[PDB]
């Protein structure tokens, strides 16, 4: 496998995206990962809607601003036969009701695909050959909010307890060997002035560190 | 016309590419408005070669790492009958002999608009109604290379005296007022790693700030 991915530079991931104050993280980590499958199949990327999520998907199991899983989210979108862009169904990080139109659909999914629980080797074969993958992770600790730069190292995280959900979009390493400091490259939704520009680099390989490979997945397009 | 705008939400922005030590930054540019007009015309997007504008435009006026214009390299894009893709004619960030490969062309011009000059409802206009719009500013300051989130603006600068090109990709505002806290959305092409993931957001309609609307115009296609 390649010593290191990034699928922002392939064309795969849309810009950083804010949830706002509501607990809509699990609709932004599933749009990240069926951005990058939906431009992997025609070429196009195309932002899609987290509101269409967050309004919609009650019926698989989701609490929109309440709380949700992305598998839940690609259940939707199946069931459903369709994904709203973001443009005709913008987001406004509260409960509303659901506005689904299936003339402004442009994703489409028939279910996802799990990584092995716990397999960090797993979830990093994964990035490399699929594209972007939807990740939960402990995100419940000031030093994550407090996140500017650097590998995140947290003693406390715990890779079980996890409670927010974000999209790897690659791994990589830092220094001049390939093993050493490794981290994975992921995308949050907090905004681009949250950590270093939206994003955080993730301590990679240091025993499932936060849980990113305890419950990762990626729609099947 | 619409309160904000992102053409990277809707497929019409390369990821975000390094001109190195070379001064290119307006065959950077110009091939970012092509990239965003050839999409629009065609729906596929497809990665334009700064390094042949580069070595190839110097009869139109440009001079290769040592400076350039946009509406020259639209010329020369007419006057030539095409424009390789970076792929096939990839840049190396150093004057090159012309090694234009009509075999390899995937984009055409037949010449560009301007926008009238210091007009900031004029560049919103064709922001909202074309794609992305190559401009010129004055990027001159510590501020600039240094800058890393927010909306940046400088009271050194000048609408008049510009020394860069670069790509407005949308415009936006802060909070629930559309008229307040207003910024240009700017591709620039110093790699990823400056600024806020490539890209700075500029204060719009703040008396032309740093020229963005002197010298602004996209190719036709
Ligand atoms: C991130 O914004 C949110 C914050 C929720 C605060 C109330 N986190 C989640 O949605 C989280 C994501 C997974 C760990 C991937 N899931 C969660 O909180 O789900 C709650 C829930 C329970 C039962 C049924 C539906 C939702
Ligand atoms: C940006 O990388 C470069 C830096 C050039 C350093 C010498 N800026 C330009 O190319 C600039 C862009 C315009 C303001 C849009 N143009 C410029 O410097 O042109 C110089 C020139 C003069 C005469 C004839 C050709 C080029
Ligand atoms: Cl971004
Ligand atoms: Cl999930
Ligand atoms: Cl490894
Ligand atoms: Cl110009
Ligand atoms: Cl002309
Ligand atoms: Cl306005």
């Known amino acids: 496998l390649p010593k290191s991915v990034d699928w922002r530079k392939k064309g795969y991931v849309t810009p950083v995206k804010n949830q706002k104050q509501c607990g809509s993280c ?3 980590s599933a749009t990240g990962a069926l951005e990058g499958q939906m431009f ?23 609490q929109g601003c309440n709380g949700g899983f992305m598998a839940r989210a690609f259940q939707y979108v199946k069931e459903n036969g369709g994904l709203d862009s973001e443009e005709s169904y913008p987001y406004v990080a509260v409960d509303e009701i659901c ?18 629980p716990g397999k960090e080797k797993a979830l990093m074969k994964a990035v490399a050959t699929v594209g972007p993958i939807s990740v939960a992770m402990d995100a419940g ?10 590998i995140y190292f947290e003693p406390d995280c715990s890779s079980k307890n996890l409670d927010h959900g974000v999209l790897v979009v690659g791994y990589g390493f830092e220094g001049a060997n390939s093993q050493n400091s490794k ?6 939704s907090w905004g681009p002035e949250w950590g270093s520009n939206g994003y955080v680099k993730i301590a990679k390989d240091k025993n499932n560190h936060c849980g990113i490979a305890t419950a990762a997945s990626y729609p099947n397009v």
Do not use: I, M
């Open 26 to 28: 699990w609709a932004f």
């Open 141 to 150: 600790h000031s030093s994550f909010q407090f996140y500017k730069s650097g």
């Open 99 to 116: 506005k689904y139109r299936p003339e402004n659909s442009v994703a489409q999914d028939t279910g996802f695909t799990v990584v092995a």
């Open 183 to 188: 981290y994975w490259l992921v995308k949050n």
């Open 40 to 62: 992997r199949k025609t070429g196009k990327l195309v932002s899609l809607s987290e509101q269409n999520l967050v309004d919609c998907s009650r019926p698989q199991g989701n």
